[PDB]
Design a protein around this ligand. Structure first.
Ligand SMILES: Nc1ncnc2c1ncn2[C@@H]1O[C@H](COP(=O)(O)OP(=O)(O)O)[C@@H](O)[C@H]1O
Ligand SMILES: Nc1ncnc2c1ncn2[C@@H]1O[C@H](COP(=O)(O)OP(=O)(O)O)[C@@H](O)[C@H]1O
Lengths: 232, 232
């Protein structure tokens, strides 16, 4: 019954995940579909200045649809364990930088500071999928800011780049609420939370696809460190 | 274990349904996104004749995306039992006609004839959802053509409109492969087949939402009759 209860909860939360993303997909479709009809029906008469503005919207809107479609695609490829990886010779220093950069504003909204130090001279080279590893970083960093300690004067998230055992190690450090001793393996299970949009499960899969491993070290209420190791 | 085996198959086929529809959604997105960028980048220079042609494609393509999005939406609303209904004063004669019309070419490709006779003078009035009841008809009719008898000289599908018990009865008749005695209730279960894209489950839900009931009568290898009754 532990399995039957497990499966009936998974099915529950898959249903909900799908219901949400279906609904999200609908709006940009409406705007695109709408804006193309506006352009179509007024075909002769439009200002170029305004033609430009209308297309910009159809473009921007189709991008939102792509992000949403890719989130739905990822969820599916995780289920079928058919998620794939496109490795490139890339510098990890600039990529980390870029992610730290990407997250900077959100971190300010919760008064958390973002920090980077590499223990090896840049550029640090690695044959990895830049987009997928960038996504791994964003998720970890994002969580650092989300689960930071409400009563901490110096809320931070830190990224430590290094070169261990013929590969690369990446630590994401945090002075937030930490993680209890029961949930340490649990938090990498899709949809799993601590109190009663793909998260750490897809991060785990990406990392393991590269051949690496991911783990956490936490003192409850004091620190959290997420470790990511990847070969060369 | 009958439940545990049932659930693990459902999860199996939901996963597959999602994987398929995600993949389908991707193409029209690419074409839309592509065609808007083509128009954007050549903004000044385009022929109106060609501007017209390009928008027609973005329009047609966004329609395909809608059909696909609605199929995904329906699947979700069936799971959450949150599918809803928009009733209109409508004539059932014209609606049946329209569906018989809609299906006419496909029926020719399998050399099946489509037929309509109403046992009450048109217009037959009913407060129903036209789109959703039209969808019910399309599914039934479609199946009549799909499961018709390979060695039958006179392959047909017939729709009988009538007015029984202060409501409406609709029979869809067929001289195909029929349905065995075990599968008569089974065929209305999502994903269920006879040998080893929402089908009869969503038809059942729509009909029951209107307050009616749906059933089948079949002699194996000779006839099939699907009954649909709806109040006024
Ligand atoms: N940096 C972190 N600090 C503390 N807890 C975390 C951190 N990252 C993740 N967790 C825990 O793991 C769970 C799963 O996280 P995740 O997969 O990123 O999804 P979400 O952040 O949307 O819950 C969270 O509910 C949280 O309890
Ligand atoms: N008109 C029909 N004649 C014989 N069998 C049918 C008919 N309609 C449906 N069935 C049976 O019910 C099953 C489910 O049908 P449906 O939900 O329409 O999905 P699909 O047609 O894609 O299988 C089919 O596999 C078929 O065996």
């Amino acid at each position: 019954s532990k399995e039957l209860e497990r499966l009936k909860r998974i099915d529950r939360m898959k249903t909900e995940f799908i219901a949400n993303i279906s609904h999200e997909l609908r709006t940009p479709l409406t705007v695109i579909k709408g804006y193309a009809e506006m352009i179509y029906n007024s075909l002769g008469e439009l200002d170029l200045s305004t033609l430009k503005e209308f297309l910009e919207t159809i473009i921007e809107q189709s991008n939102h649809l792509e992000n949403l479609l890719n989130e739905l695609l990822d969820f599916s490829r995780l289920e079928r364990k058919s998620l794939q990886i496109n490795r490139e010779k890339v510098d990890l220093c600039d990529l980390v930088e870029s992610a730290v950069n990407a997250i900077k504003e959100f971190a300010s909204s919760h008064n958390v500071n973002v920090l980077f130090e590499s223990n090896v001279p840049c550029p640090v080279e690695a044959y990895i999928d830049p987009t997928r590893i960038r996504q791994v970083l964003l998720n970890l960093l994002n969580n650092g800011v989300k689960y930071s300690k409400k009563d901490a004067p110096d809320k931070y998230v830190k990224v430590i780049l290094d070169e261990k055992d013929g590969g690369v190690l990446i630590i994401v450090e945090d002075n937030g609420i930490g993680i209890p001793d029961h949930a340490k393996d649990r938090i990498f299970e899709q949809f799993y939370r601590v109190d009663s949009g793909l998260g750490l499960a897809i991060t785990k899969e990406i990392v393991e696809l590269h051949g690496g491993r991911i783990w956490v070290e936490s003192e409850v209420g004091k620190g959290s460190r997420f470790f990511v190791w990847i070969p060369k």
